[PDB]
Design an enzyme around this catalytic site. Structure first.
Site, PDB file in Angstrom:
ATOM      1  N   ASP A  67       2.675  -4.492  -5.670  1.00  0.00           N
ATOM      2  CA  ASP A  67       1.932  -3.435  -4.993  1.00  0.00           C
ATOM      3  C   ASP A  67       1.047  -4.026  -3.900  1.00  0.00           C
ATOM      4  O   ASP A  67       0.403  -5.061  -4.096  1.00  0.00           O
ATOM      5  CB  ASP A  67       1.084  -2.651  -5.999  1.00  0.00           C
ATOM      6  CG  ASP A  67      -0.219  -3.355  -6.348  1.00  0.00           C
ATOM      7  OD1 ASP A  67      -0.174  -4.519  -6.801  1.00  0.00           O
ATOM      8  OD2 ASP A  67      -1.294  -2.743  -6.162  1.00  0.00           O
ATOM      9  N   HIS A  70       0.997  -6.996   1.077  1.00  0.00           N
ATOM     10  CA  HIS A  70       0.312  -7.462   2.277  1.00  0.00           C
ATOM     11  C   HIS A  70      -1.147  -7.799   1.999  1.00  0.00           C
ATOM     12  O   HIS A  70      -1.703  -8.709   2.625  1.00  0.00           O
ATOM     13  CB  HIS A  70       0.428  -6.406   3.376  1.00  0.00           C
ATOM     14  CG  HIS A  70       0.286  -5.002   2.879  1.00  0.00           C
ATOM     15  ND1 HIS A  70       1.344  -4.290   2.354  1.00  0.00           N
ATOM     16  CD2 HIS A  70      -0.787  -4.179   2.817  1.00  0.00           C
ATOM     17  CE1 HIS A  70       0.929  -3.088   1.995  1.00  0.00           C
ATOM     18  NE2 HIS A  70      -0.361  -2.995   2.265  1.00  0.00           N
ATOM     19  N   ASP A 202       4.237   7.480  -5.268  1.00  0.00           N
ATOM     20  CA  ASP A 202       3.068   7.703  -4.437  1.00  0.00           C
ATOM     21  C   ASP A 202       3.315   8.761  -3.372  1.00  0.00           C
ATOM     22  O   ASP A 202       2.422   9.020  -2.559  1.00  0.00           O
ATOM     23  CB  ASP A 202       2.633   6.393  -3.770  1.00  0.00           C
ATOM     24  CG  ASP A 202       2.061   5.396  -4.757  1.00  0.00           C
ATOM     25  OD1 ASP A 202       2.848   4.605  -5.314  1.00  0.00           O
ATOM     26  OD2 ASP A 202       0.832   5.411  -4.985  1.00  0.00           O
TER      27      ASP A 202
END
Lengths: 401, 266, 658
Positions: A67, A70, A202
């Site tokens: 998750d 980045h 999501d």
């Protein structure tokens, strides 16, 4: 948490940021940020804890899903994925990665060893935006050029030769040279593999962002791409609303074979047949067309002439009657494979202890005319006027020659 | 067999691009191993590096890669191995890199400067994809259909979970994505993890109980399993946060937040 | 009649069979009239064709078995042809009977297609109904037969007619009923021993028949989820460390079966070997609806669902309690179980002679083996006298035991079996590998009969009671010692399940004699024709005074049984491939594969079976044959193990060489 429009490469809990002081944090009081340093020397328990955490699931599962990869620091992610890879050498790494650019996205994949990046289809705002999204992950253009060594290569007089292109055993699973001159297949930068999700956990449900009918064409468009696909449970089950991961406790309904379930059975089995017929980037070609609320997807293998043709009338909104012109395919023969329509049969049930989707009718369609001119060798494909928004048809195609 | 690719390098040690597919990564093809063979039996792929004849890097030129030289040798990101560059003004040099295990590898070059110093090019990475089989049925990475399922919504029993497995296996997915299966924190979100080192006790008992369920998915439904992994945070009520508060950002570890603490406590 | 009628009758049949299942296909194609009554409370049954009789199945096969010869000769004069012209009753029968099964998977859709076409047929002139009736039935039959081949595994779906005709017996035998089942709390799919008489109530399920057939009918075809449910359903009925033969749906079963428990554990190994991931069966938890000791029938007591036993401990419990010894008189013994068995026959005892490691049991008042015919002729004075009591060491029981031991040894090696000790009646412990190597050393010694008189001093031989050398004994130290030295096909079971116990030349030469002696055209002769007790004609109605033949005591001495032919030819295959070099050829990649000379030999021994299932009104193989292929009018016309053991052979050849 996360800064609003901030670079995810900068640790906003570190000295180089004032975001907690300047209040620029959208925060998760739910979770507490972990402080890895420049190495294990800066947090020897956290690194030791995460290591055994990683090493445990690497013994069990076949891969990971990271998750906000980045926001995870580089040297951290590199260390633990290397640790997992020592446990499970065939580790399949997936990441919802959106760094500041594509070049940086590729850099993360390089050093972390990510095998697939996640791309979402529900982010599309309009029919065209989806078609572009589908064009990105659809494949290479049809009739695209193939690479050969030309006058930019050395030709050693003593170079090995596969005379009559016959030194490849199908069970050796070799990487074939371009031709008889055995100049090995070229290692070139290709884009990182994509895992195209028709909807993530999501994403707002199609009922919310569009309507429930799009669950059929959307999933078909995604499934026709030359990439890994995915879906959350309930998308096919046509749930009415995005589940709150925090609050909700209701349980998945046991109502079987609802909504798209029969179609995803067809699609995945359809892709199972395509299987290992396309290996390198130039083996799988495509053509995506956007016309109003219609989106056309032709999927083509560049070696054998087999193809699949998807006509998808999408339902972002109820936008009226639109008639698509006759589809023309040159030097191609077509064949009806399947067709479906999805229509809502009233609103969703209201329950407190179980989550049930919206009642749907998966109606099979007919009325498709496939004319073939025996002279011009041009197949014509006509749609019936009974093709409501949220419907698909799939044609098997075959190029002649 | 023939599982070799040609990685041409420039006169500065950069890899040559053969086609313009856009910004990308040097990924080797997704292929199954040959007949009935294990990772140890043979190099998975062989990367043949081509160095240009008489280029500046051929002067005392060395190739350095963290690619282990043997299957027995394990992989260390920071341990690099030397390969000598055969200098010729007429003939290029070729340097095979036998690869025995999937993962991420990289290589750079070292050569003698024009000041007789030691200069070093950038690290250049190439990736070897894993080999996903389900029951000795190879799965190409481009044919994966993954199902995301949240466990706290799959009922309270393992038996109540295999009902979901059979439903998705009917829809012909071949991989299931599992939201984190560990003991959750206060707010019960699956990503705020109470304890990362043991699983949800409401459903599971031991590590063996989940590994057997995952293997049961593999053999009865031909489905592979993968899980979320959270690195960036833990739940705000971990029993080890009391024994180890330094794993976070403290007034001690990250002093710059002291000015930020007294802004929330005020 | 219009140009569209033609396309109407030939279309829509594949879509109708879409939602069918290998279970539900039984209700569309087969269903013996007694199986049909079970669902109809006796109202319906099979269609009586005037001047002819009834089709043997209520389903489409009943029509097809008659129509095939009628279409071939255009027999428009046939009674069925006449009846189809004079009325629409047979037309309506085809559709209406599915009301009994309208709720089962895909039958409602198949019924609608049949209904939609039959109604359109009735609107035709009377003289055209027969051809369209036969055409419509034939079309839906094929689509159902195709659906069966699609649902089954590759080896069945790509094979010859003969292999597929065998596999369709698995659908004949596996259906759900209303009078019985394999589980006490539910009514689910339950494999009949055979049709029509072993199909209803207590007469349907038999543990010995279920698991001998389980490999062939269920595993070779791919019905794994149905093989598991049959295994688990008998797991609940374990008591005395034995498996019952008369499964009364898991509701007061009869435990006079020394054989079933070892065919039961054999199938478990077959399940684990074949099913992908079959090791998962071992940890499957079963509701043990009987006590861990061996009390008495308490089907309503709360201690029924009292405790749980995994298949792991279930396997071990059979092995352990067998060693530790088992002593019990059958629960509820008396006439209300066997109205002819004597008072001492309800006392069953079984233990192991640890000087050999094999298993002895039974008596001259018992029928613990598959040869379980109990005499009953009052006029011939045989009331209570077992025709073939097989007491002591039965070859198969120990061969099946070695197979079980070999199974659990390599199993524990892979961390899937936690047990190693085994308690003796005194208090000693023996490792499973020790018990294994005990049989490996003593089996062939106690059972072989050497061809050379010189070697008798090594194989515990009493040359006074012999008939043929070069043989494996049928029994070891039984009651009548001359019944030890009888040539019976039973030894082939041990050759199949535990070939490690046999030296190749002895097994090869022994089974070549069975090929010349015990091998009939379709049935395996159950007794050497040179024996004095050889009576190969079975009349369960003979009233006369003959001690052998009256009331059918011959059942297991002479008559030629078909399921034994399966275990025979499987071993005939294995050992002619190991021994005779002319039966070997360098298969691709030098791996050893059989030659055409051996295939030609196997082929010549299955022709008479193909002929049988071809020209049989029931599309199956008989359970029994009289001497030299003569039809036994008391033999069941289709039996499970009769076909399931020929399928066993085909799976051998497939799983090993293709």
């Amino acid at each position: 948490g996360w800064i609003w429009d901030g670079n995810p490469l900068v640790d906003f809990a570190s000295s180089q940021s004032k975001a907690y002081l300047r209040r620029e944090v959208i925060v998760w009081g739910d979770c507490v940020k972990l402080r890895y340093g420049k190495g294990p020397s800066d947090s020897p328990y956290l690194w030791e804890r995460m290591s055994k955490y990683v090493e445990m699931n690497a013994r069990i599962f076949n891969g990971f899903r990271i998750d906000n990869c980045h926001s995870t620091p580089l040297h951290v992610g590199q260390y633990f994925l290397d640790v997992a890879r020592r446990v499970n050498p065939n580790l399949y790494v997936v990441a919802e990665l959106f760094s500041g650019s594509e070049a940086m996205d590729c850099l993360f994949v390089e050093r972390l060893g990510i095998s697939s990046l996640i791309r979402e289809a529900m982010q599309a705002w309009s029919e065209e935006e989806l078609s572009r999204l589908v064009h990105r992950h659809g494949g290479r253009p049809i009739g695209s050029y193939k690479f050969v060594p030309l006058d930019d290569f050395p030709y050693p007089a003593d170079v090995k030769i596969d005379e009559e292109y016959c030194a490849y055993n199908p069970d050796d699973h070799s990487v074939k040279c371009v031709s008889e001159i055995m100049i090995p297949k070229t290692l070139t930068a290709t884009p990182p593999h994509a895992l195209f999700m028709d909807c993530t956990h999501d994403n707002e449900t199609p009922n919310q962002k569009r309507t429930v009918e799009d669950t059929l064409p959307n999933a078909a468009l995604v499934a026709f791409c030359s990439s890994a696909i995915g879906s959350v449970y309930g998308y096919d089950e046509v749930f009415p609303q995005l589940l709150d991961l925090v609050q909700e406790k209701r349980t998945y309904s046991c109502a079987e074979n609802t909504g798209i379930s029969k179609v995803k059975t067809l699609l995945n089995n359809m892709r199972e047949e395509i299987a290992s017929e396309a290996v390198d980037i130039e083996d799988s070609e495509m053509h995506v067309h956007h016309d109003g609320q219609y989106i056309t997807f032709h999927r083509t293998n560049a070696k054998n002439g087999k193809g699949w043709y998807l006509v998808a009338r999408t339902k972002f909104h109820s936008s009226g009657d639109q008639m698509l012109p006759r589809i023309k395919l040159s030097q191609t023969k077509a064949t009806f494979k399947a067709a479906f329509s999805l229509e809502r049969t009233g609103d969703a049930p209201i329950s407190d202890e179980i989550i049930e989707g919206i009642p749907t009718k998966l109606r099979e369609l007919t009325g498709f005319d496939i004319g073939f001119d025996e002279n011009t060798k041009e197949t014509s494909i006509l749609l019936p006027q009974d093709f409501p928004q949220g419907s698909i048809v799939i044609f098997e195609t075959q190029q002649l020659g | 067999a023939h599982r070799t690719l040609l990685l041409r390098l420039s006169d500065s040690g950069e890899p040559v691009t053969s086609c313009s597919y856009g910004q990308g990564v040097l990924t080797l093809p997704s292929l199954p191993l040959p007949q009935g063979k294990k990772l140890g039996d043979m190099p998975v792929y062989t990367v043949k590096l081509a160095i240009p004849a008489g280029s500046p890097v051929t002067r005392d030129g060395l190739i350095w890669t963290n690619c282990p030289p043997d299957f027995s040798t394990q992989f260390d990101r920071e341990k690099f191995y030397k390969k000598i560059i055969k200098t010729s003004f007429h003939e290029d040099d070729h340097i095979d890199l036998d690869i025995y295990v999937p993962g991420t590898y990289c290589f750079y070059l070292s050569f003698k400067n024009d000041k007789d110093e030691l200069e070093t090019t950038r690290k250049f990475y190439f990736v070897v994809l894993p080999i996903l089989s389900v029951n000795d049925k190879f799965i190409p990475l481009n044919s994966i259909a993954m199902q995301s399922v949240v466990s706290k919504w799959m009922g309270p029993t393992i038996k109540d979970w295999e009902k979901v497995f059979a439903r998705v296996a009917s829809k012909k997915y071949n991989m299931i994505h599992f939201t984190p299966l560990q003991h959750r924190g206060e707010s019960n979100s699956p990503y705020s993890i109470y304890d990362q080192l043991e699983f949800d006790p409401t459903v599971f008992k031991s590590e063996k109980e989940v590994a057997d369920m995952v293997e049961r998915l593999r053999t009865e439904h031909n489905i592979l399993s993968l899980t979320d992994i959270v690195f960036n945070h833990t739940a705000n009520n971990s029993q080890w946060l009391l024994d180890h508060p330094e794993a976070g950002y403290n007034h001690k570890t990250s002093p710059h937040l002291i000015s930020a603490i007294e802004l929330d406590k005020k | 009649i219009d140009d569209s009628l033609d396309h109407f009758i030939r279309s829509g049949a594949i879509k109708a069979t879409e939602k069918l299942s290998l279970e539900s296909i039984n209700y569309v194609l087969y269903r013996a009239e007694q199986e049909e009554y079970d669902y109809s409370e006796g109202r319906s049954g099979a269609y009586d064709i005037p001047d002819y009789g009834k089709p043997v199945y209520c389903g489409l096969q009943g029509w097809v078995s008659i129509l095939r010869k009628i279409i071939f000769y255009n027999d428009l004069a046939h009674p069925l042809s006449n009846n189809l012209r004079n009325g629409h009753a047979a037309v309506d029968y085809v559709v209406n009977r599915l009301d009994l099964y309208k709720d089962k998977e895909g039958v409602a859709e198949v019924q609608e297609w049949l209904r939609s076409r039959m109604e359109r047929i009735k609107q035709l002139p009377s003289y055209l109904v027969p051809s369209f009736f036969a055409l419509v039935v034939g079309i839906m039959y094929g689509c159902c037969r195709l659906r069966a081949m699609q649902l089954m595994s590759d080896n069945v779906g790509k094979s010859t007619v003969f292999v597929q005709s065998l596999a369709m017996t698995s659908i004949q035998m596996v259906s759900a009923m209303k009078s019985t089942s394999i589980l006490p709390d539910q009514n689910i799919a339950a494999m009949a021993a055979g049709l029509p008489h072993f199909s209803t109530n207590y007469m349907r399920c038999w543990g010995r028949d279920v698991f001998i057939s389980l490999r062939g009918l269920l595993l070779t075809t791919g019905r794994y989820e149905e093989a598991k449910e049959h295994i688990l359903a008998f797991a609940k009925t374990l008591k005395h460390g034995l498996i019952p033969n008369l499964l009364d749906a898991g509701r007061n079963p009869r435990y006079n079966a020394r054989d079933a428990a070892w065919f039961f554990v054999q199938a478990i190994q077959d399940y684990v070997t074949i099913v992908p991931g079959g090791v998962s069966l071992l940890q499957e938890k079963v509701t043990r609806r009987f006590p861990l000791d061996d009390e008495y029938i308490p089907y309503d007591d709360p201690k029924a669902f009292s405790y749980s036993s995994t298949i792991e401990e279930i396997i071990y419990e059979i092995l352990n309690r067998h060693a530790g010894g088992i002593k019990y008189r059958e629960a509820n013994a008396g006439p209300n179980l066997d109205r002819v068995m004597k008072d001492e026959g309800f006392n069953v005892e079984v233990n192991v002679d640890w000087e050999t490691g094999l298993i002895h049991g039974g008596s001259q008042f018992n029928c613990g083996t598959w040869m379980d015919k109990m005499g009953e002729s009052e006029k011939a004075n045989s009331v209570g006298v077992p025709g073939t009591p097989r007491d002591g060491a039965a070859v198969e029981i120990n061969g099946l035991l070695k197979s079980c031991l070999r199974f659990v040894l390599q199993l524990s090696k892979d961390g899937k079996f936690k047990y190693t000790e085994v308690t003796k009646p005194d208090g000693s412990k023996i490792s499973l590998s020790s018990w294994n190597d005990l049989l490996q050393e003593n089996f062939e010694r106690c059972f072989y009969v050497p061809k050379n008189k010189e070697d008798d001093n090594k194989f515990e031989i009493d040359a006074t009671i012999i008939n043929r050398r070069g043989i494996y004994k049928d029994l070891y130290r039984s009651g009548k010692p001359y019944e030890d030295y009888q040539f019976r096909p039973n030894f082939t079971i041990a050759m199949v399940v535990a070939p490690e116990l046999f030296t190749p030349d002895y097994a090869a030469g022994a089974i070549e004699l069975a090929d010349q002696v015990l091998r009939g055209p379709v049935g395996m002769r159950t007794l050497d024709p040179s024996d004095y007790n050889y009576r190969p004609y079975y009349n369960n109605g003979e009233d006369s005074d003959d001690f052998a033949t009256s009331k059918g005591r011959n059942y297991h001495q002479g008559p030629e049984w078909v399921w034994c032919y399966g275990y025979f030819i499987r071993a005939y295959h294995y050992f002619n491939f190991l021994t005779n070099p002319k039966c070997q050829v360098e298969g691709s990649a030098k791996k050893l594969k059989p030659s055409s000379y051996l295939y030609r030999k196997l082929y010549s021994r299955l022709l008479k079976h193909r002929e049988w299932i071809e020209n049989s009104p029931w599309a199956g193989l008989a359970e029994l044959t009289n001497k030299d292929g003569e039809v036994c009018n008391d033999s069941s016309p289709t039996q499970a193990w009769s076909t399931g053991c020929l399928l066993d052979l085909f799976y051998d050849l497939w799983i090993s060489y293709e």
